[PDB]
Amino acid sequence: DRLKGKVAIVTGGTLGIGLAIADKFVEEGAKVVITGRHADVGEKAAKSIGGTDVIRFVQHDASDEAGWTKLFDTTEEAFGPVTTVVNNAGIAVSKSVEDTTTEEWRKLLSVNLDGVFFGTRLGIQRMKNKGLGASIINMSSIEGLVGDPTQGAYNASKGAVRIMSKSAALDCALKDYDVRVNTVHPGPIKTPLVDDLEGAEEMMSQRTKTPMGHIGEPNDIAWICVYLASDESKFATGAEFVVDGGYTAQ
Amino acid sequence: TDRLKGKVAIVTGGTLGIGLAIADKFVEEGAKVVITGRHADVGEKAAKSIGGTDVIRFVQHDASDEAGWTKLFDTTEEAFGPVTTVVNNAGIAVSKSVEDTTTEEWRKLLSVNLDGVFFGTRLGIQRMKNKGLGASIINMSSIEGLVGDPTQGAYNASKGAVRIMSKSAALDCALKDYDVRVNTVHPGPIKTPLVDDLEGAEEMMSQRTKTPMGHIGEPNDIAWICVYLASDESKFATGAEFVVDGGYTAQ
Amino acid sequence: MTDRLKGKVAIVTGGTLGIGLAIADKFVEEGAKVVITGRHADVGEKAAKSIGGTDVIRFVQHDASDEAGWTKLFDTTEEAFGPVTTVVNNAGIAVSKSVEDTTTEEWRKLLSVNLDGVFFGTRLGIQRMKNKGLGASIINMSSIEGLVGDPTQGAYNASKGAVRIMSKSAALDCALKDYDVRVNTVHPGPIKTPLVDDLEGAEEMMSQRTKTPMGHIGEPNDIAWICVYLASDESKFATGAEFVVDGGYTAQ
Amino acid sequence: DRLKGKVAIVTGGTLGIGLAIADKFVEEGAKVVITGRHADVGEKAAKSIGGTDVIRFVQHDASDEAGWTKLFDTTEEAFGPVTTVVNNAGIAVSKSVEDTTTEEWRKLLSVNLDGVFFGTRLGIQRMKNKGLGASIINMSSIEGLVGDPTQGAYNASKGAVRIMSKSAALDCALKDYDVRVNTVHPGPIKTPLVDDLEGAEEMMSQRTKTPMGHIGEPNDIAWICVYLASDESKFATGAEFVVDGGYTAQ
Ligand SMILES: NC(=O)c1ccc[n+]([C@@H]2O[C@H](COP(=O)([O-])OP(=O)(O)OC[C@H]3O[C@@H](n4cnc5c(N)ncnc54)[C@H](OP(=O)(O)O)[C@@H]3O)[C@@H](O)[C@H]2O)c1
Ligand SMILES: NC(=O)c1ccc[n+]([C@@H]2O[C@H](COP(=O)([O-])OP(=O)(O)OC[C@H]3O[C@@H](n4cnc5c(N)ncnc54)[C@H](OP(=O)(O)O)[C@@H]3O)[C@@H](O)[C@H]2O)c1
Ligand SMILES: NC(=O)c1ccc[n+]([C@@H]2O[C@H](COP(=O)([O-])OP(=O)(O)OC[C@H]3O[C@@H](n4cnc5c(N)ncnc54)[C@H](OP(=O)(O)O)[C@@H]3O)[C@@H](O)[C@H]2O)c1
Ligand SMILES: [Cl-]
Ligand SMILES: [Cl-]
Ligand SMILES: [Cl-]
Ligand SMILES: [Mg+2]
Ligand SMILES: [Mg+2]
């Protein structure tokens, strides 16, 4: 259907937002590789969506540079030329800038920023100039648009992804690469991980935070990623797609 | 399966160009559509080019005509049932710097591009709130609502106004649990017979210093993002700006 | 009196109260000659005298939505002080209505001042200040409400988003044509002024930490000082930009 | 007199933009410590501005975390408690995202991002709750607002600075630290950084790039920094100050 012929890598694809992206990608006809760090979880997640003819799990840590080349080779071996890269893997640190230790800072940025860099750079190299309608979708958060006093390192990583993606988009467009790069900026989304933090959903559902008075669900982010992966969005590049319940509109 | 099943849409300025493509893809996705425009022969031919009166109808209406807006909703509702979707797309251009803009040009453009969008948004909230329709208002606000252009002063004013007024509406609807979303769409240069009739226009906007992709878009590029915004797929998106511009604003 | 605006001649619309008064006050303190406008001659004459004598500041009764009066206002100012170098389009009004609840009368009245007035002053300011080596500067008063929405200020939001982007168009045309005129926008957050004071509950609502992270609203001098920077030749490379002084309001 | 009583650290204050900031800060009454890696350049720069009663040089690489603590100690010993931190040190790499080596990425980010994090975190720690009218000014760029196809790592670093600074501003404000944090976004400015990239001034002077048709001068950035360091800006925090010749207005 809407993603006919697409082959997608979805990092952090075994839980929450990434899992829903993979689910709707398969529903729309794409073949998907979802990555994660734990194999006992990752395989049941893939099977929860489809069989190995449409979706497969590959253990990969987004900060693992060499593993990225291996991840692409495995995906192409399974499904053919990669067309779509969703850089979704990330981690959080609940600290102000003042209270962030240098170890927390470096570890978060090696996943949230270096990992997105590794996936974007390689995706451009492996997908340019092949008539694929290639699309790189970088998950860049409402925390890439506004600050949060207790997400200092996360804010830095998401702001970096936001503008680095415009650089990539412009270079691909100017060089007729047939690769588009866009960022998605989710507001608060209900996941089992948000569930395990007592008070988190309640805090984020305050009207002063999310004007809709509730947080979203993973499918809310999947559907905008479907649009961005499909050729329906062949004129969209370097842009920010915000699905946040009004959070940044006030 | 149809992504706009059961939706009922008004698309102003929907007989040519971007509005016509939005109407076409809306019908294709299962919506019933009323398109508006000022000229009846163009408008009737436009509607029939998309489908029969069971899925699409033309209503003659100038978007700056405040009184006509209530009749337009009534006509749409009697044909298709309650309106769920309003695309405020009607708009005109003035090729003048702020310095060179006449007061008559200023007022005429703003009466369509700003007053009209206000009339449709205000009435849309009134008529669609609290009805469980998954209502969506889509305001066309242009890259000229994000960046300035030295020779588009009044257009820039109108589109910046639509951009932020739409956030006001989105927030009020959300805080009041109205079940109405309001978002803006920001097209870059798009090929239309309007652009084709202006010699060198497509060539100027295709320069890499304007559009990095080196070409201008097509009306269906805007239609597809409007389908996303009209559908229940985007039920968590409100008050946000959706930019389809070939990279224009990213540099 | 010091000298960061030496030789400048400024029109400050709505300069008899609140933010406009503070702009005029600090402009005079920095060496500028100033004409303030307003609709009430009694408040306005006293406002000007409260800042200085007629050799540094004068009041002119003018509604900013009155197009023909704009030409007379420039003539009167240049007759008094020489060619105008600086236009601060500050006059503005508010309406506490959602988009849904805004009447068309309220919509047109607010926009005739907040948008048409800024257009009239920007258009005429370009015509009368271009190509004169003045280091000219047009400062258009937007608001944080030109950057984010407010559910109960629909028309005001529209007017301030219009000012924000129209000003960019004017700045670009002036720059590309070497007019020696800059155009920038100032976006105050909540500021203690009569506009705020006489909206019951407004300061209290805006002082909440969920609104202004600094936990209080600003004061008129906060906006005067960024305007002094923008009117001075210190900002000669600044054009088409948005200057936000808002207590952190738009950072979260 | 506009900076009477202020004590400022200006990283990379020995050439270009940072030198002009230091110069104007001293003119307005501040005591200033400038940093840089090269003591030959730095000692002369300090002497070109004033005597050791108003300005001193400290050899320090902004990417050196341990050195930041020494730098604040040295400044305190000379001039009293620091009131103003200008995180200005930065470098550039003329590579698209596709063409960026991981070494180039890590080197630029360790200076442009880690260094701004180190100085912001330390500035907050050292200046909070002292009633100093403290101000942290983080040097971003128009390249933290828009992309550039050939400055991918730089774009990443400047977008990170932009949004991390908002987080810091918010935390300082909500906690009543009496510390403001803002970012400055220069457009092209004539500096050794620009003068060494051959053809860069000519490129950035095109009207399609800078509408004013010329690039700026270091004093253009000095004056907005004076405003931000002074108590004139006591209501300005978390905001972006753009001095760019119209670059980002089109
Ligand atoms: N400047 C740019 O950068 C640029 C370039 C290309 C496209 N765009 C985008 O294109 C979008 C839509 O414009 P378009 O190019 O599709 O225009 P278009 O091709 O001229 O189509 C105009 C449609 O609106 C109708 N219309 C005109 N005035 C009207 C009124 N007062 N009331 C109701 N309908 C009216 C037209 O004819 P009738 O009145 O006879 O029906 C026609 O159906 C804008 O948001 C703009 O951002 C922008
Ligand atoms: N206060 C805030 O929190 C705040 C925040 C962001 C932006 N702003 C903006 O800053 C500007 C000044 O606001 P403020 O709070 O200082 O307002 P204010 O305290 O109400 O003062 C408004 C001034 O404008 C004059 N004025 C009003 N309507 C006018 C018209 N049609 N023509 C000429 N002068 C007129 C008033 O004098 P007369 O009544 O005698 O005419 C008065 O001198 C406005 O553009 C406002 O939107 C204010
Ligand atoms: N020039 C522009 O057009 C422009 C535009 C926007 C933003 N900016 C930003 O403004 C800032 C200053 O740029 P500029 O053009 O003035 O550069 P510049 O002329 O090359 O000056 C660089 C200064 O920083 C110092 N420096 C370099 N690496 C350092 C390190 N690791 N630790 C400490 N100091 C270091 C240099 O001294 P040593 O070599 O002795 O260390 C020198 O004092 C940078 O953040 C830049 O990204 C510049
Ligand atoms: Cl994210
Ligand atoms: Cl009057
Ligand atoms: Cl200290
Ligand atoms: Mg906000
Ligand atoms: Mg641009």
User: In what helix (H) or strand (E) does residue A67 lie, and over which residues does it extend?
Assistant: helix A65-79
State the DSSP code for C67: H
- A111 token code pair: 């996943």
Residue C64 in marked binding region: yes
Which residues of A are marked as active site? Answer: 154
Q: Where would I find the H helices in chain D?
A: 16-27, 39-49, 65-79, 102-109, 115-127, 152-174, 192-196, 200-205, 218-229
Chain A contacts to B (CB-CB under 8 A): 166, 169-170, 173-174, 176, 187, 207, 211-213, 216-217, 220, 223-224, 227, 232-246, 248-250
Name the β-bridge partners of D185. Answer: D242
Whole-Å CA distances, D101 to A107, C244, D107: 20, 37, 10
DSSP annotation string for B9-69: EEETT-SSHHHHHHHHHHHHTT-EEEEEES-HHHHHHHHHHH--TTTEEEEE--TT-HHHH
- Identify residue A84 by its one-letter amino acid code: T
Q: Which ligand 2 atom lies nearest to the CA of residue C94?
A: 47
Give the three-state DSSP class for C212.
coil
C-alpha B97/C-alpha B152 separation (Å) is: 6
| Backbone φ, ψ for residue A235 (5° rounding) | -105, 5
Whole-Å CA distances, D108 to A120, D37, D151: 18, 15, 11
Q: Is D154 a catalytic residue?
A: yes
CB contact (8 A) between residue D249 and residue C240:
yes
Spatial CA neighbour of A152 closest among D161, C40, D16, B62: D161
Spatial CA neighbour of D70 closest among D118, D26, D106, D139: D118
Going by alpha carbons, the residue nearest to atom 45 of ligand 2 is C92
Residue for token digits 């497509």?
Answer: B202
* Chain A residues within an 8 Å CB radius of D176: none
Give the three-state DSSP class for A203.
helix
Whole-Å CA distances, C168 to B148, C122, C138, C161, C183: 5, 11, 11, 11, 7
Residue for token digits 């009764």?
Answer: C61
How far from chain centre, in Å, is Cα D163? 15
How far from chain centre, in Å, is Cα B67? 20
Q: Which one of C71, C166, C176, C182 would you mutate to disrupt binding with B, by most B Cβ within 10 Å of its Cβ?
A: C166
Residues whose CB is less than 8 angstroms from the CB of residue D45 and which lie 6 or more positions away in sequence, other chains included: D13, D14, D15, D19, D22, D34, D36, D57
- Is the CB of D61 within 6 Å of ligand 3? yes
* Chain B residues within an 8 Å CB radius of C177: 150
User: Is there a contact between C76 and C133 (Cβ–Cβ < 8 Å)?
Assistant: no
Which one of D19, D71, D88 would you pick to mutate in the ligand 3 pocket, going by the greatest count of ligand atoms within 8 A of its CB? D88
* Chain B nearest-CA residue for D211: B150
Chain B contacts to A (CB-CB under 8 A): 167, 170-171, 174-175, 177, 188, 208, 212-214, 217-218, 221, 224-225, 228, 233-247, 249-251
Question: Quick one: CA torsion of A177, A183, A184, A186, rounded to 10 degrees?
Answer: 160
Q: What is the resolution of this structure in A?
A: 1.9
User: Is there a contact between A106 and A28 (Cβ–Cβ < 8 Å)?
Assistant: no
Spatial CA neighbour of D156 closest among A120, A85, A137, A113: A113
- A234 token code pair: 């062949």
Sort strands C242-245 and A179-186 into parallel, antiparallel or unpaired: unpaired
User: Is there a contact between B162 and B113 (Cβ–Cβ < 8 Å)?
Assistant: yes
Of A148, A208, A249, the CB nearest to C149: A249
Neighbours of chain A (3+ CB pairs under 8 A): B, C, D
Spatial CA neighbour of A84 closest among A92, A76, A96: A76
C-alpha D214/C-alpha D200 separation (Å) is: 12
- D103 token code pair: 């070494």
CA contacts within 13 A on the Cβ side of C69: 12
Residue A151 in marked binding region: no
Name the β-bridge partners of A7. Answer: A31
* Chain D residues within an 8 Å CB radius of C178: 213
| Backbone φ, ψ for residue A134 (5° rounding) | -75, 150
- C202 token code pair: 């407004």
- Shortest CA gap A89–chain B (Å): 22
CA contacts within 13 A on the Cβ side of A38: 6
Signed CA dihedral, B53, B57, B58, B61: sign only: positive
Give the three-state DSSP class for B86.
strand
Residue for token digits 């919506």?
Answer: B31
Give the three-state DSSP class for D96.
coil
DSSP annotation string for B221-240: HHHHHHHHHHSGGGTT--S-
User: Is there a contact between D11 and D234 (Cβ–Cβ < 8 Å)?
Assistant: no
Report angle CA B192, B196, B197 to the nearest 5 degrees: 115
Residue for token digits 């920001």?
Answer: B186
User: Is there a contact between B236 and A220 (Cβ–Cβ < 8 Å)?
Assistant: yes
- Is the CB of D133 within 6 Å of ligand 3? no
* Chain A residues within an 8 Å CB radius of C213: 149
Residues whose CB is less than 8 angstroms from the CB of residue D182 and which lie 6 or more positions away in sequence, other chains included: D135, D136, D137, D138, D165, D169, D228, D233, D236, D237, D238, D239, D240, D241
User: Is there a contact between A17 and A45 (Cβ–Cβ < 8 Å)?
Assistant: no
Residues whose CB is less than 8 angstroms from the CB of residue C27 and which lie 6 or more positions away in sequence, other chains included: C5, C8, C10, C12, C34, C86, C224, C227, C228, C231
Exposure b/e, A47-63, CB count within 10 A at least 16 = b? eebbeeebbbbbebbbb
Which one of D32, D35, D37 would you pick to mutate in the ligand 3 pocket, going by the greatest count of ligand atoms within 8 A of its CB? D37
Beta strands in chain A (DSSP E): 7-10, 31-36, 55-59, 84-87, 134-139, 179-186, 240-243
Q: Rounded to a whole number, what is the distance in angstroms from the first to the last CA of chain D?
A: 37
Give the three-state DSSP class for A230.
coil
Spatial CA neighbour of C28 closest among C61, C60, C57: C57
C-alpha D156/C-alpha A183 separation (Å) is: 13
User: In what helix (H) or strand (E) does residue A120 lie, and over which residues does it extend?
Assistant: helix A115-127
* Chain A nearest-CA residue for B170: A246
- Identify residue D146 by its one-letter amino acid code: V
* Chain A nearest-CA residue for B242: A241
* Technique behind the model: X-ray
User: Is there a contact between B157 and C166 (Cβ–Cβ < 8 Å)?
Assistant: yes
Q: Which ligand 2 atom lies nearest to the CA of residue C190?
A: 3
Closest ligand to the CA of C44: 2
Burial (CB count <10 Å: 0-12, 13-18, 19+), residue C96: middle
- D206 token code pair: 């095109």
Distance from the alpha carbon of residue D18 to the mean position of ligand 3, in angstroms: 7
User: Is there a contact between B101 and B48 (Cβ–Cβ < 8 Å)?
Assistant: no
Name the β-bridge partners of A33. Answer: A9, A56
Residue for token digits 């510390």?
Answer: D179
How far from chain centre, in Å, is Cα D156? 16
Residue for token digits 């090729």?
Answer: B95
- Identify residue B233 by its one-letter amino acid code: E
User: Is there a contact between B217 and A231 (Cβ–Cβ < 8 Å)?
Assistant: no
Sort strands C86-89 and C136-141 into parallel, antiparallel or unpaired: parallel
| Backbone φ, ψ for residue D183 (5° rounding) | -120, 145
Size of interface A-C (CB pairs under 8 A): 13
User: In what helix (H) or strand (E) does residue C182 lie, and over which residues does it extend?
Assistant: strand C181-188
Residue B38 in marked binding region: yes
Rg of chain C, C-alpha, whole Å: 17
- Is the CB of B17 within 6 Å of ligand 1? yes
Spatial CA neighbour of B121 closest among A58, C98, C219, A189: C98
Domain range summary for chain B, segments of one domain joined by +: 1-251
- C160 token code pair: 């301030």
Exposure b/e, C21-52, CB count within 10 A at least 16 = b? bbbbbbbbbbbbbbbbbbbeeeebeebbeebb
Chain B contacts to D (CB-CB under 8 A): 147-150, 209, 250-251
User: In what helix (H) or strand (E) does residue B70 lie, and over which residues does it extend?
Assistant: helix B66-80
User: Is there a contact between D171 and A96 (Cβ–Cβ < 8 Å)?
Assistant: yes
Strand order in the sheet with A240-243: A55-59, A31-36, A7-10, A84-87, A134-139, A179-186, A240-243
- C182 token code pair: 């800059």
- C53 token code pair: 């004598």
Residue for token digits 């049932």?
Answer: B81
Closest ligand to the CA of D201: 3
Spatial CA neighbour of B72 closest among B110, B124, B137: B124
Whole-Å CA distances, C152 to A207, C203, D103: 15, 15, 52
Strand order in the sheet with C181-188: C57-61, C33-38, C9-12, C86-89, C136-141, C181-188, C242-245
Spatial CA neighbour of D154 closest among D220, D206, D100: D100
Spatial CA neighbour of A221 closest among A247, A190, A178: A190
C-alpha D59/C-alpha C149 separation (Å) is: 47
Query: What crossing angle do the helices spanning A16-27 and A218-229 adopt, rounded to 10°?
Result: 50
User: Is there a contact between B89 and B71 (Cβ–Cβ < 8 Å)?
Assistant: no
C-alpha B236/C-alpha A142 separation (Å) is: 13
Q: Where would I find the H helices in chain C?
A: 18-29, 41-49, 67-81, 104-114, 116-129, 154-176, 194-197, 202-207, 220-231
Question: Quick one: CA torsion of B12, B17, B23, B25, rounded to 10 degrees?
Answer: -150
DSSP annotation string for B100-155: T--HHHHHHHHIIIIIIHHHHHHHHHHHHTTSSS-EEEEEE--GGGTS--TTBHHH
User: Is there a contact between C21 and C220 (Cβ–Cβ < 8 Å)?
Assistant: yes
C-alpha C189/C-alpha C208 separation (Å) is: 13
